[PDB]
Design a protein around this ligand. Structure first.
Ligand SMILES: C[C@]1(c2nc3cccc(C(N)=O)c3[nH]2)CCCN1
Length: 191
């Protein structure tokens, strides 16, 4: 099993991944076309992620502890994410407004913007689909190196993730190597 393989279009899995992507494209639904879908395989990261998930299901209060989220990226960054997973140390110096972590969107309409998934010379855009252990979340801010502090009224000292808004979150920020698993890569383009 190779790290990146084309997903056959005669499968229920292909139809389900494409339907969830279109369901959260909002105003961009009629201007985006799917070119192909690929399955990501990283056996060591998947096994380490599943152990973290089991621990969170036993400890965490909020349900669900896991969410399916989107991550737009550049064409040259694709092989490194497939081979090693997501890495907060490569966040860069620009626009880390909710901390030095890896950023995920609840809605495909955010990650499909050219500022997050810029097209290559052939017009193709890269958007990963990932299983993310969001658990209990707190407010994100610039300079965070780990999730924010819980404060008084809690035994645990830090949250599991950071967000843009604590009431209706649209962006989640992750600060641990085994807390997000890339499962699919959607290649898309402007109609
Ligand atoms: C600009 C930055 C980023 N912010 C995002 C907010 C929502 C979605 C994504 C995404 N990639 O789909 C974001 N990426 C932060 C540090 C380097 N990437």
């Amino acid at each position: 099993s190779m790290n990146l393989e084309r997903l056959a279009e005669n499968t229920g899995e292909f139809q389900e991944v494409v339907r969830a992507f279109y369901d959260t494209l909002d105003a961009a639904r009629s201007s985006i076309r799917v070119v192909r879908v690929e399955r990501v395989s990283h056996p060591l990261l998947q096994q380490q992620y599943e152990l973290y998930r089991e621990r969170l299901l036993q400890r965490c209060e909020r349900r669900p502890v896991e969410q399916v989220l989107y991550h737009g990226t550049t064409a040259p960054a694709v092989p490194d994410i497939c081979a090693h997973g997501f890495n907060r140390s490569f966040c860069g110096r620009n626009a880390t407004v909710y901390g030095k972590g890896v950023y995920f969107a609840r809605r495909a309409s955010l990650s499909v913007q050219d500022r997050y998934s810029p097209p290559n010379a052939d017009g193709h855009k890269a958007v990963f689909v990932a299983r993310v252990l969001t658990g209990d979340y707190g407010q994100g801010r610039r300079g965070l190196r780990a999730p924010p502090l819980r404060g008084p009224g809690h035994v645990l000292l830090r949250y599991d993730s950071a967000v843009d808004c604590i009431c209706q979150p649209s962006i989640f920020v992750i600060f641990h190597d085994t807390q997000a698993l890339p499962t699919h890569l959607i290649t898309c383009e402007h109609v």
